[PDB]
Amino acid sequence: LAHSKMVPIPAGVFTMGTDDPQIKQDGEAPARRVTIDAFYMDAYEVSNTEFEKFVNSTGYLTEAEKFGDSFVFEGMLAAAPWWLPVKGANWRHPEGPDSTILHRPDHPVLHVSWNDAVAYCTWAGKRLPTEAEWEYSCRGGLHNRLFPWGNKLQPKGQHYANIWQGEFPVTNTGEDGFQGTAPVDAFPPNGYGLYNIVGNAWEWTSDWWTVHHSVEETLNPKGPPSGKDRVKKGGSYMCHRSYCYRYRCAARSQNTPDSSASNLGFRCAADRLPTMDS
Ligand SMILES: *[C@@H]1O[C@H](CO)[C@@H](O)[C@H](O)[C@H]1NC(C)=O
Ligand SMILES: [Ca+2]
Ligand SMILES: [Ca+2]
Ligand SMILES: [Cu+]
């Protein structure tokens, strides 16, 4: 395994957002042309094993551990009736104190806040991606498509991401092979070599959240200078067209930076390769 490996994301200009927004309240529109300098993106969501290396090295206690609770989706035992604050839920105990990560070391780390993610990425010699970098990377070299791979959810009759199948929230059929998370290296890569960029775990980005965007062309944009919530991208194993259609590269949501949940993780980015881990 090389679950901290990065891929080179080429310099380019791309269309961020969409003039055909599917969730208008989220500021998916307007489409705008954005120029991105070449950089590096983690191929994988940060896994439990990789996060454990960080905690072993630094002693870091995550925010959910210090607060003593985190949000867990009821279907695997608040923003919605299916989100419950569970005492003792955290990255090591993703459904609460009687759950474990021992059987899922290669799954994405969960219950990590924005601050926890920044701490990990900086320890790794990296950083969070901006929203524009994240979306450009998600799109995988394709223009104005719904998904990293194109416009069909199941191209060639194949599942390409870990989302929900069945009637949410009562029945997840696990048709795609995974009820909860999947290993970080599951499913096909996109055109840039990224795995699970849509689905699996949601992913923090560095930007403050706003829904007000201009059509002006921009260069390496960082988002607004202030805010109260940080932007997350890409959707999760819970998403379904019927209620939360956020497994599209253009989709976007937000949470306060001290937030954490059982469907929210991250990956890192870097301007240049960090020191080789000998
Ligand atoms: C973290 O440290 C513990 C205790 O030394 C060890 O058992 C475990 O394998 C370490 N985890 C990683 C990912 O190195
Ligand atoms: Ca699934
Ligand atoms: Ca993901
Ligand atoms: Cu969703």
From Swiss-Prot:
> Per the record, what is one GO cellular component?
endoplasmic reticulum lumen
In this protein, the residues bearing a glycan are 56
Cofactor binding description = The catalytic copper is required to activate oxygen and catalyze oxidative C-H activation.
Which residues are noted in the entry as Ca(2+) 1-binding?
A: 162-163, 176, 178
Q: How is it modified after translation?
A: N-glycosylated. Contains high-mannose-type oligosaccharides.
* Disulfide bridge positions per record: 121-268, 138-249
- Identify which top EC class this enzyme belongs to: oxidoreductase
Remarks, miscellaneous:
The resulting 3-oxoalanine in the substrate protein is called C(alpha)-formylglycine by many authors. It should not be confused with N-formylglycine.
The protein here is known as Formylglycine-generating enzyme
Q: Which organism is it from?
A: Homo sapiens
